[PDB]
Write a protein that binds this ligand. Structure first.
Ligand SMILES: CCCCCCCCCCC[C@H](O)CC(=O)SCCNC(=O)CCNC(=O)[C@H](O)C(C)(C)COP(=O)(O)O
Ligand code: SF4
Ligand code: SF4
Ligand code: SF4
Ligand code: SF4
Ligand SMILES: [K+]
Ligand SMILES: [Zn+2]
Lengths: 238, 60, 95, 96, 115, 129, 115, 209, 176, 45, 145
């Protein structure tokens, strides 16, 4: 859906209402999850002080996202280097305390709640306008315009056959993905196809530091640790 | 004592196939990179391509 | 696919909250699956005059990277002014 | 219309039918050769030719955005009927 | 210009020394692969294959190249030791399922249009 | 430059054993260094400014089921680009591939003149506009 | 100074009960280690400037919170940590000595990436 | 706005990044070959390959840099260059919320000092550059294949390497094993030659040679 | 703005410590955990009765590919090969040849469902709305070869799901 | 006509709860211990 | 060029003209660059192509029915910058972005004109001229095309 230049097509009529209805009740489900896990003496024993990471060790290990926020490091790309319109919504970053599994889990739940707040703000501040950049050389023209006008047809043909030529250069753009700082180093050459697209993956760095976390911890603690990273090997293996 | 992770058990050559595809053609690759957070990957790629193209999406 | 009043009290007491007010099952509050046709607006460049692409061009106004030193008192500088310490959230400081 | 080759194989609209001395027909036994009976070559033929009263006429295929890109056909040659290159509909000047 | 950085060795003799000790490790290893990996090829039937693999790239003369394949062979030995390769991975060295290919020109002409 | 007992390695560079290319696909192939010719359909020369290296076309048979263009030549769709001919031949020799470089053809500078279209003595006078 | 903070926030960073003295001795050590660097080198000039200013600010302010705001380097413990890091950097840069001119011009067009 | 589609341009960030580029160039003239700021406010420092350990350490430890997070470490292969491999370091400074790029060059058979000592996150990254491209990193705690299958022969991300490789896998019942065979695709990858023969951007027009 | 998620020191009043000891000995939060699951068992299950009950969809749903045709009967496809040129997985193979009448139509239009990624890029690229992603998604096959779609199979899908696909496009073409 | 697209209602959507709502319930520790001890005493008698 | 249009009227349409079994003509696509006319006059010698009328209705053709028959006729297909003149045997067979181009030498005549064989799916689709400036300039004969 999200594409260079905006979004593919506009939201179907009557979707904001459904999103509001769902987000109204999602708080109860979050509270139920908390009541299920937060204060349980079993969960609070398998995740408290299990997998502690130091602040400087976390920074040096290339960690990002929760594993920084979970260990006192006050960093979040949504606030420090805002992208899109993240400089408008108001939210709080759940800074962690101890750096263990329990602290990171609490951080994740609080991020869920803050994201619910951001969803409410986005629903209440939807502006009028179009969906893609008003440039038929980087965004395909509307299907109505394509079937009526010369330039729209030509641009649609060339965009869907050749594509938009990206100016030569290289960039590294990263965002606060729900896992961490997901980034891309995109290197173009002036043609219609990329020359080198390297993917910076928080999962890669987090799994690189798995051994440092699991020191003296038993196998069950390792089961907890490879879960506190939310490790996904689609992103890791690229 | 030691825990060596042997990743690559799902290594699709994504960063190699991306070159052979155009920027629009490479968009679905990022959706298939992280399968639990999806629109964020497309958002990152779109921001990169927009920054390279020196264009900005509409406020909506 | 409605519970009796006796049951609702048992569910509410076992959970400690009014579940009937906020349920996870959508009954009728959803938007109707058939909707009136939409009329999408136009962008800021759907003008019949003063709409030359030279002004609106985005790709062609990207200069090559600017070199600041090549191989072919002066106060120390910084990449940017230092970050400013974050403040506690007045909404809910301590969880 | 779909017709039967001497072997027994139905020919498609593309004129495709495996030869008798072709082993590939083995795939079709105990199965059927999936073909489309509604031939576009025939179905467009009996569509009436519209008697357009102008030198040129615009065709969009019907339905506006639902159809094909709008194109203008020049109806000047009395020996032929202008046919849209997208949908195949014909047009003709009223006896010129 | 004509003179460039070295990888590990500073002459051909040291590169040959490293090749020698790598062959030492492989030759000592082979029966351990035969037993541990439950291989069915004879011990000699693996040692001669190690010899043939060493003899394959016996024509190289750039030292840095020799150190590079020394490291690569060390990595393959590392994989073979701590059961990182499996039975199929090891058996790939003996190309078994591959039909034998012809060497004379006449058979190649008979079989297809290739060099 | 590099103070690590900087060693003379005069003999020519060769990574034929460090690329993983099998036996067959390293001498029986013949790369071709050439500047691509302009597509005569068009009239733009922006595709005739970079040297290209390509491999000889091999067998391309039809798939029995559907009729695809089945092939068994991995180095068939791989074409490298190079800024200069010398760099391309350096890459070809470095990887041990036989080459046959073709020189870059350049359009000879013509001599255009509008006046010759309406000459008085010569045969370049056009009979139409 | 004032009431000592219970924790520094970031884990691992233990609260330092002697911030002013630690900062003073670290800055003096940094200056003395810099003294070995030749004066013409930019490292010496810039680091001496920065350490001189920050030493002055440390000497002036006796309030820990006001010193924290003035140095603009997060909490004080981060400031001692980064002062130690700069001391180690100067110690290693003694050996590296980047004051010497460029080691080697890049070969032709290693840069210039329209290709 | 007058530029509703053109991405807004920030010039203050450009000035700050240029100032820091001159700062780094003056600090380490031994290795810093060429520094440049892109139009979208990203600073790149091209250093000699010997300056991998020093320069990074400086950027990690200096009070005015404080780049304490190796975001990404990658390589770009350009066959037309002498030293084709081009190693890229991306660093992020959380104190000055700034991103920097340190780019060095290296051929096929030239080693690079491993930055594991400086950035312990690099330990895995380096292996990837070794596995994908073949750049050997000396003084590395353990260099091994990280992504390719065991016994793989070649470096996939190299330009002179087919995207389909040379060997495919199959299961053979005769040997009851997952054997490897020469590659043979049912449908060959249709190579599309999509490139307009008309110059796109006059700004990046290479002067004739 | 940031919040300390776990920075709460427990009170050390005799009542507080008595309550903590009571919770430890007489398991209290454990009983709350039991009560939550008791409350949800007494709640209504969310399962639907497939295949007699189907999960909701939208008119934009991407499913089985199909070739549409004009109301007259002529196919919409004109072999412009935009869909083949835009497919990220190269799943479309097109061979064109001028028909006997003269109109340019595909002599071969094969879409490989085993290689398709169901992105919908083809249906956007098509300038005549010839190729679409139908609403069908229950088309699993027992053999692999049945997923290699021919022109005839795609035309059959277009003739079969035309009633649904025409309505789906009618309810969505204005958004595009 | 006018433009039509999915929009929030003219007055905006209602409030969205996000804070934790873990309710407090149960007797005090003294009361719980007293009930347990009283049950033990009655059973003993 | 721009990325939209401000033309809100009816376009023109031109009756097609027949010039033989090699060059298919869709004259409504003609931009009237008169390049085919100049090529026929000078390179081909035969003065059978030209214009008719004036204004927006001035059309490029032969007026009377007369096939453009010459050994170098097919080269007009290359000369036309638009799809007004197209190769009849190649009509509706392949797209330019998908054909692999292989340079070769013509063997029909003895001039040895350099050509580009564009093949897709292991099948020859069309022969285009390749510029040499000594052998064939940038033209080929019809027996070569
Ligand atoms: C199969 C199951 C087990 C798993 C798989 C077992 C086989 C794995 C093999 C891995 C190692 C790799 O193939 C080879 C390498 O690294 S280096 C080979 C020697 N090549 C050179 O050193 C170059 C120059 N060559 C010489 O100098 C002469 O060849 C010689 C060394 C004999 C000296 O001779 P002189 O003295 O006469
Ligand atoms: S929807 Fe299917 S057929 Fe269409 S482009 Fe995507 S993968 Fe290819
Ligand atoms: S995009 Fe549509 S008209 Fe063009 S070839 Fe594909 S199906 Fe046919
Ligand atoms: S070459 Fe083509 S566009 Fe030019 S005048 Fe002739 S037919 Fe028209
Ligand atoms: S491809 Fe060119 S000549 Fe053909 S219709 Fe489009 S603009 Fe006209
Ligand atoms: K033409
Ligand atoms: Zn029509």
């Amino acid at each position: 859906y999200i594409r260079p230049g905006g979004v593919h097509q506009d939201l179907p009529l009557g979707l904001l209402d459904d999103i509001y209805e769902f987000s109204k009740n999602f708080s109860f489900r979050i509270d139920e999850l908390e009541e299920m896990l937060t204060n349980n003496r079993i969960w609070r024993n398998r995740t408290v002080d299990i997998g502690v990471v130091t602040a400087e060790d976390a920074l040096n290990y290339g960690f990002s996202g929760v594993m920084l926020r979970g260990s006192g490091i006050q960093w979040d790309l949504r606030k420090t280097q805002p992208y899109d319109v993240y400089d408008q919504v108001e939210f709080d970053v759940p800074i962690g305390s101890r750096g263990d599994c329990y602290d990171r889990y609490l951080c994740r739940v609080e991020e869920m709640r803050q994201s619910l707040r951001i969803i409410s703000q986005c629903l209440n501040k939807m502006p009028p306008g179009e969906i893609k950049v008003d440039d038929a050389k980087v965004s395909p023209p509307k299907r109505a315009e394509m079937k009526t006008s010369m330039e729209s047809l030509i641009h649609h043909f060339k965009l869907y056959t050749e594509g938009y030529q990206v100016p030569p250069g290289a960039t590294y753009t990263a965002i606060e993905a729900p896992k961490g700082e997901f980034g891309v180093y995109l290197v173009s050459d002036g043609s219609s196809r990329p020359y080198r697209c390297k993917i910076k993956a928080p999962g890669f760095a987090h799994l690189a530091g798995l051994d440092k976390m699991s020191k003296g911890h038993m196998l069950a603690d390792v089961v907890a640790i490879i879960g506190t990273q939310d490790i996904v090997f689609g992103e890791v293996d690229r | 004592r030691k825990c060596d992770p042997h990743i690559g058990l799902l290594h699709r050559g994504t960063e190699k196939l991306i070159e052979y595809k155009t920027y629009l053609q490479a968009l679905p690759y990022f959706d298939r990179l992280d399968y639990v957070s999806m629109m964020c990957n497309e958002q990152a790629y779109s921001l990169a391509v927009e920054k390279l193209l020196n264009i900005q999406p509409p406020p909506r | 696919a409605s519970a009796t009043r006796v049951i609702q009290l048992l569910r509410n007491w076992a959970s400690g909250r009014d579940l009937q007010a906020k349920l996870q099952l959508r009954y009728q509050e959803i938007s109707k699956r058939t909707q009136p046709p939409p009329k999408l607006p136009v962008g800021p460049s759907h003008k019949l005059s003063n709409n030359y692409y030279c002004t609106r061009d985005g790709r062609r106004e990207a200069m090559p990277p600017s070199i600041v030193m090549s191989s072919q008192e002066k106060k120390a500088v910084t990449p940017a002014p230092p970050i400013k310490r974050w403040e506690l959230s007045k909404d809910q400081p301590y969880l | 219309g779909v017709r039967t080759s001497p072997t027994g194989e139905k020919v498609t609209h593309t004129g495709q039918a495996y030869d008798d001395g072709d082993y590939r027909r083995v795939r079709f036994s105990d199965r059927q050769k999936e073909v489309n009976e509604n031939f576009a070559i025939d179905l467009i033929a009996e569509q009436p030719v519209s008697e357009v009263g102008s030198r040129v006429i615009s065709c969009d295929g019907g339905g506006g955005a639902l159809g094909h890109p709008r194109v203008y056909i020049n109806l000047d040659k009395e020996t032929k009927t202008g046919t849209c290159g997208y949908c195949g509909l014909q047009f003709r000047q009223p006896h010129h | 210009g004509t003179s460039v950085k070295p990888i590990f060795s500073r002459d051909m003799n040291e590169a040959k020394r490293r090749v020698r000790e790598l062959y030492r490790a492989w030759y000592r290893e082979v029966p351990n692969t035969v037993h541990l990996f439950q291989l069915d090829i004879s011990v000699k039937q693996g040692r001669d294959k190690v010899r043939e693999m060493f003899m394959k790239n016996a024509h190289v003369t750039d030292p840095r190249v020799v150190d590079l394949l020394v490291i690569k062979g060390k990595m393959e030995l590392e994989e073979t030791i701590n059961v990182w390769k499996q039975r199929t991975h090891i058996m790939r060295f003996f190309h078994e399922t591959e039909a034998p290919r012809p060497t004379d020109f006449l058979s190649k002409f008979y079989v297809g249009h290739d060099p | 430059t590099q103070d690590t007992q900087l060693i003379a390695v005069d003999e020519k560079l060769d990574i034929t054993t460090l690329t993983g290319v099998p036996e067959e696909h390293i001498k029986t192939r013949k790369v071709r260094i050439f500047v691509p010719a302009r597509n005569n359909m068009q009239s733009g020369v922006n595709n005739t400014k970079k040297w290209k290296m390509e491999f000889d076309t091999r067998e391309r048979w039809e798939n029995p089921l559907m009729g695809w263009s089945s092939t068994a030549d991995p180095l068939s769709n791989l074409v490298l680009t190079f800024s200069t001919k010398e760099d391309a031949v350096a890459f070809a020799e470095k990887n041990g591939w036989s080459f046959d470089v073709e020189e870059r053809k350049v359009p000879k500078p013509k001599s255009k003149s509008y006046g010759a279209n309406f000459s008085w003595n010569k045969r370049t006078r056009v009979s139409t506009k | 100074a004032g009431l000592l903070k219970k924790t520094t926030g970031l884990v691992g960073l233990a609260v330092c009960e002697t911030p002013h003295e630690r900062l003073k001795i670290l800055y003096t050590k940094i200056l003395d280690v810099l003294g070995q660097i030749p004066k013409n080198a930019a490292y010496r000039k810039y680091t001496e400037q920065i350490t001189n200013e920050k030493l002055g600010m440390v000497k002036a302010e006796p309030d820990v919170k006001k010193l924290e705001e003035q140095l603009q380097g997060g909490q004080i413990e981060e400031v001692i940590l980064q002062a130690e890091n700069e001391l180690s950097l100067a110690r290693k840069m003694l050996r590296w000595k980047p004051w010497e001119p460029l080691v080697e011009e890049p070969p032709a067009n290693q840069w210039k990436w329209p290709i | 706005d007058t530029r509703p589609t053109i991405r807004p341009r920030n010039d203050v960030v450009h000035k700050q990044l240029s100032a820091f580029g001159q700062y780094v160039a003056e600090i380490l003239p031994k290795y810093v070959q060429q520094v440049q700021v892109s139009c979208f406010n990203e600073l790149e420092i091209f250093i000699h390959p010997d300056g991998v350990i020093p320069v990074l350490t400086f950027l990690r430890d200096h009070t005015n840099a404080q780049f304490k997070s190796l975001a990404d470490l990658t390589a770009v292969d350009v066959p037309t260059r002498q030293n084709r491999f081009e190693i890229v370091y991306n660093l992020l400074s959380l104190r000055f919320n700034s991103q920097i790029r340190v780019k060095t060059y290296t051929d096929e058979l030239t080693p690079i000092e491993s930055s594991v000592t400086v950035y312990k996150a690099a330990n895995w990254y380096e292996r990837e550059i070794w596995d994908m491209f073949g750049v050997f990193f000396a003084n590395h705690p353990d260099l091994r294949r990280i992504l390719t299958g065991y016994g793989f022969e070649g470096h996939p991300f190299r330009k002179d390497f087919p995207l389909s490789g040379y060997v495919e896998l199959r299961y053979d019942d005769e040997v009851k094993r997952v054997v490897a065979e020469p590659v043979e695709l049912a449908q060959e990858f249709r190579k599309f030659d999509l490139n307009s023969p008309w110059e796109a951007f006059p700004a990046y027009r290479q002067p004739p040679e | 703005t940031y919040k300390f998620v776990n920075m709460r020191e427990p009170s050390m009043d005799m009542k507080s410590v008595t309550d903590r000891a009571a919770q430890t000995l007489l398991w209290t939060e454990l009983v709350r955990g039991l009560g939550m699951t008791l409350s949800y068992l007494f709640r209504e299950p969310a399962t639907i009765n497939y295949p007699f009950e189907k999960g909701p969809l939208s008119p934009r749903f991407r499913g089985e590919h199909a070739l549409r045709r004009y109301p007259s009967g002529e196919e919409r496809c004109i072999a412009c090969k935009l869909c083949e040129a835009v497919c990220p997985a190269q799943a479309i193979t097109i061979e064109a040849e001028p028909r006997a009448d003269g109109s340019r139509r595909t002599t071969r239009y094969d879409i490989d469902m085993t290689k398709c990624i169901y992105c919908g890029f083809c249906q956007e690229a098509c300038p005549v709305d010839a190729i679409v992603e139908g609403p069908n998604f229950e088309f699993s096959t027992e053999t692999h070869e049945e997923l290699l779609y021919n022109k005839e199979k795609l035309l059959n899908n277009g003739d079969k799901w035309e009633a649904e696909i025409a309505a789906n496009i009618q309810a969505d073409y204005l958004y595009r | 006509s006018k433009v039509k697209q999915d929009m929030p209602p003219p007055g905006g959507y209602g409030p969205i709860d996000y804070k934790r709502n873990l309710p407090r319930r149960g007797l005090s520790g003294y009361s719980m211990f007293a009930v347990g001890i009283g049950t033990l005493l009655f059973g003993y008698w | 060029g721009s990325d939209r249009s401000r033309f809100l009227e009816g376009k023109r349409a031109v009756e097609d003209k027949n010039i033989g079994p090699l060059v298919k003509t869709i004259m409504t696509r003609c931009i009237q660059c008169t390049r085919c006319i100049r090529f026929a006059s000078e390179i081909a010698g035969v003065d059978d192509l030209g214009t008719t009328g004036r204004g927006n209705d001035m059309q490029v053709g032969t007026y009377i029915e007369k096939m453009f028959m010459s050994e170098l006729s097919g080269n007009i297909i290359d000369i036309c910058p638009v799809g007004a003149l197209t190769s009849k045997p190649y009509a509706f067979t392949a797209r330019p972005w998908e054909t692999r181009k292989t340079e070769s030498i013509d063997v029909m005549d003895a001039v040895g004109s350099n050509i580009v064989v564009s093949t897709r799916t292991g099948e020859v689709m069309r022969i285009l001229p390749r510029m040499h400036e000594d052998i064939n300039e940038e033209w080929i004969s019809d027996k070569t095309r």
